[PDB]
């Protein structure tokens, strides 16, 4: 292949290429009219055809980053321009992309959306690709190409009914956040840490497959994601399409779960394999200890390849423990490597290695007992009240943080409780990991935008594996000077009784926060006393004949009394 464009145009096909090219342009030039991107893509497409016709024809030879880089530089940047002088021969384009600056899409009315989708369809779907990508610049291209199929699907069936369009948006926000964490994680920690992550992931999903079949996959999976983060982005679709292709053909040596997935069309099959259920873990496995802890050959075995040995130890743990989080497994592997290094240059190394599971135990039980305490508490209190018990926890821990932010975390976190304590004990830690990683991802991106505590920052850029623990490590802040009393923020009105449940809660939580900030001393029993007295205050005044006089009057009686319980 001399002509890359034509190597891609041939493999991907025209529809995929155009979408992929549009995504790349959209991801780079975010604030930039749809009609621009459309124009550029049409100029590339037409040029790709002339390279399918003739590899010999000029500039077919030039690299895509040049070719695409060339067209971005076509098109004045008053609205990042300096990279454009020359297509970089990108690292300027990336890190020059904000994760956070465009009006939130406001949906056109459903009859109008339906008319247009019927009237053009091709433009309407293209605009989707266009809008999500500018808003979300680290989304995997292959999944996107599919979300759009799941758009075109909704409209064709719906046009009663599009709550489903709202769900698609919620999934996109997630499959966005995760790709950015993955890309960042590879860039900060290297390709090694990612390869390890992937091992853990796939050996849980496929405990039957051989360590050589996993390893092969991890190399291909790491290639794809290394490209999609580099952003050339046609290769990934090409190379991911070759993974699915491969896995489909080798189901029998991988998973008994892939049958239903590997019948589905090219775009859908790839999504299904990644969501596919873990296989039944095999029978007649020896104990983990016998190769890794019991053997008197560890050091020699570790020495011949350090990396394969570690990779095997991780694969074995993972097949054994689907329940364990991918991050816990990685921490355990790190501990093993650390042990082997101190132990191997030692007299009696086997005696030093032998007591190594004594170290894994604390790491396994930290998250498990953590999950339990919080699932118990969720199960007695329920979503809202649990949210409230979290608002007190975390504002006691980091009071310096801004209230609207506190009330956004704690509500999301309590929503995690209701999405993971639903599941049987088995699946909690994987599910928790999944949801928490987005929330610590967005939280730490914001703290750098507007930093307020040093301790949070340390947790926000220690090892990825360290951070959920580091935040769990955070204790109650005992230097915090109580914020000043302020009457308007502890004053309520008639409106709260009319407002919707959603609105109401946030209002009542926002108060809770500000209460803790003003009285961070008070014990949870004192603070149960107040939220009880508040509950009573709200329901009384909601039944009262003159709401407002009741709110006004009882408000002063309440506050008078509650400050009287400072002491």
């Amino acid at each position, epitope marked *: 292949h001399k002509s890359e464009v034509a190597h891609r145009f041939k493999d991907l096909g025209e529809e995929n290429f155009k979408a992929l090219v549009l995504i790349a342009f959209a991801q780079y030039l975010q604030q930039c009219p749809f009609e621009d991107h459309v124009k550029l893509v049409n100029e590339v497409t037409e040029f790709a055809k002339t390279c399918v016709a003739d590899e010999s024809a000029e500039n077919c030879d030039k690299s895509l980053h040049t070719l695409f880089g060339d067209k971005l530089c076509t098109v004045t940047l008053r609205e990042m321009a300096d990279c454009c002088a020359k297509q970089e021969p990108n690292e300027c384009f990336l890190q020059h992309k904000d994760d956070n600056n465009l009006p939130r899409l406001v949906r056109p009315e459903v009859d109008v959306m339906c008319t247009a989708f019927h009237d053009n369809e091709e433009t309407f779907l293209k605009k989707y690709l266009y809008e999500i990508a500018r808003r979300h610049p680290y989304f995997y291209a292959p999944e996107l190409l599919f979300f759009a199929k799941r758009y075109k699907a909704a409209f064709t069936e719906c046009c009663a009914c599009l709550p489903k369009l709202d769900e698609l948006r919620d999934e996109g926000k997630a499959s966005s956040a995760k790709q950015r964490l993955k890309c960042a994680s590879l860039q900060k920690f290297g390709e090694r840490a990612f390869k390890a992550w992937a091992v853990a992931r796939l050996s849980q999903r496929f405990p*039957k497959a*051989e*360590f050589a079949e996993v*390893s092969k996959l991890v190399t291909d999976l790491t290639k794809v994601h290394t490209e999609c983060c580099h952003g050339d982005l046609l290769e990934c679709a090409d190379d991911r399409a070759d993974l699915a292709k491969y896995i489909c053909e080798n189901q029998d040596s991988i998973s008994s779960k892939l049958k239903e997935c590997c019948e589905k069309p090219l775009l859908e099959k790839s999504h299904c394999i990644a969501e596919v259920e873990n296989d039944e873990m095999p029978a*007649d*496995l020896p104990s983990l200890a016998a*190769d*890794f802890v019991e*053997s008197k050959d560890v050091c020699k075995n570790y020495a*011949e390849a350090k990396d394969v040995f570690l990779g095997m130890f991780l694969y074995e743990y993972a097949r054994r423990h689907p329940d364990y989080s991918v991050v816990l497994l990685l921490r355990l592997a790190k501990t093993y490597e650390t042990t082997l290094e101190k132990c191997c240059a030692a007299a009696d190394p086997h005696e030093c290695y032998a007591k190594v599971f004594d170290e894994f135990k604390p790491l396994v039980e930290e998250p498990q007992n953590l999950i339990k305490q919080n699932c118990e508490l969720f199960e007695q209190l329920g979503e809202y009240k649990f949210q409230n018990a979290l608002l007190v926890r975390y504002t006691k821990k980091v009071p310096q943080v801004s209230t609207p932010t506190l009330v956004e975390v704690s509500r999301n976190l309590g929503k995690v409780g209701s999405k993971c304590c639903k599941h049987p004990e088995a699946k909690r830690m994987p599910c928790a990991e999944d949801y928490l990683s987005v929330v610590l991802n967005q939280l730490c991106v914001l703290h750098e935008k507007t930093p307020v505590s040093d301790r949070v920052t340390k947790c926000c850029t220690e090892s990825l594996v360290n951070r959920r623990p580091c935040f769990s490590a955070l204790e109650v802040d005992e230097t915090y000077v109580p914020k000043e009393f302020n009457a308007e923020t502890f004053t309520f009105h008639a409106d709260i009784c009319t407002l919707s449940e959603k609105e109401r809660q946030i209002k009542k939580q926002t108060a809770l926060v500000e209460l803790v900030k003003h009285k961070p001393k008070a014990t949870k029993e004192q603070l149960k006393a107040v939220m009880d007295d508040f509950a009573a205050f709200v329901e009384k005044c909601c039944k009262a004949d003159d709401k407002e006089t009741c709110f006004a009057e009882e408000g002063k009686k309440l506050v008078a009394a509650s400050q009287a319980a400072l002491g």
Partner: nanobody
Amino acid sequence: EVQLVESGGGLVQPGGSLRLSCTASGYMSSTYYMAWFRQPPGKGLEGVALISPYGGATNYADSVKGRFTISRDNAKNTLYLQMNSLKPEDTARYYCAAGSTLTMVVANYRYWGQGTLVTVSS
């Protein structure tokens, strides 16, 4: 491809010894759970001995416990089977297998050898 190759097999006096070797070729050849299976004349395959990737775990059929040992070099890429106190019973084609588990099931091994023959009689 992941090739297996066997050798060491022949004729041997009852009471004597033989050491089979299987050399392994292909990616990640060292990693796999590996097994010896024998096929006595006019019968099916049956597991003689099994060995984990680093030789820290070994199963044996009862037929041969106390007489046979199973070992792997790994660097060499060669799997062994040290046969002692041979009995005419043990006269079977011997076969090498590679898989993902320490199980004694023919179906659960992906890769097989061509098989070396062992005869035991005076």
